[PDB]
Design a protein around this ligand. Structure first.
Ligand SMILES: *[C@@H]1O[C@H](CO)[C@@H](O)[C@H](O)[C@H]1NC(C)=O
Ligand SMILES: *[C@@H]1O[C@H](CO)[C@@H](O)[C@H](O)[C@H]1NC(C)=O
Lengths: 106, 99
């Protein structure tokens, strides 16, 4: 509706008998393949991303925001738990890091 | 000629012009749109088509209506079966109703 891409903002300019909109959009540019999974199995519990998507660089699993590659360690602040690891099709095992474990150990 | 009104129309200077796009081309467009949707979700509408597994795209949609994605994943076969049945009903209705 406001240009091609994800609309950011628009600026109007007057023209004879009409109007010209300068639409500013965000266009994703340089995509890279990744291996992905719907959920992560850690301790017999299925984990799902709170905001992003699980991606593998080939050996290591990260969670990233969906529209810009920004890989982050998979932690319990990153994810939420729902159910065991038996229903989800395509679940993979990986560790889900607990931020409070080192603090309790320290 | 008498058994055809088109002949009278043509004989009195009234003609029908063919569309620029043939039916085959329009079907090509629809199939391109369908392939883009089922392989990349909404990404091909904004930029390059970014492939994504279809179940994960469905999880994105469920998030888009305020349902957590585990609801999609834990009922994935139920949801797929409901969709398949609904498509079948569309088929049967088209095969039954002529207007
Ligand atoms: C992803 O891998 C496929 C497999 O051949 C390839 O065709 C495609 O171009 C790759 N895309 C990117 C962005 O690397
Ligand atoms: C993931 O872990 C489960 C639980 O131990 C195991 O049964 C399964 O084989 C593992 N999957 C892979 C691909 O290693």
């Amino acid at each position: 509706f406001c240009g091609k891409g994800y609309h950011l903002m628009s600026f109007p300019q007057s023209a004879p008998h009409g109007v010209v909109f300068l639409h500013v959009t965000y266009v994703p540019a340089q995509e890279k393949n990744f291996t992905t999974a719907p959920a992560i199995c850690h301790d017999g519990k299925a984990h799902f991303p709170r905001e992003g998507v699980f991606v593998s660089n080939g050996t290591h699993w990260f969670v990233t925001q969906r529209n810009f590659y920004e890989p982050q360690i998979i932690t319990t602040d990153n994810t939420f738990v729902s159910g065991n690891c038996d229903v989800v099709i395509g679940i993979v095992n990986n560790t889900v890091y607990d931020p409070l474990q080192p603090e309790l150990d320290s | 000629a008498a058994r055809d009104l088109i002949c009278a129309q043509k004989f009195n200077g009234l003609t029908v012009l063919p569309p620029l796009l043939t039916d085959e081309m329009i079907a090509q467009y629809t199939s391109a749109l369908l392939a883009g949707t089922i392989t990349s979700g909404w990404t091909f509408g904004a930029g390059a088509a970014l492939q994504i597994p279809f179940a994960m795209q469905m999880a994105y949609r469920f998030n888009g209506i305020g349902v957590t994605q585990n609801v999609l994943y834990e009922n994935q076969k139920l949801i797929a079966n409901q969709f398949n049945s609904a498509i079948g009903k569309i088929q049967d209705s088209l095969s039954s109703t002529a207007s």
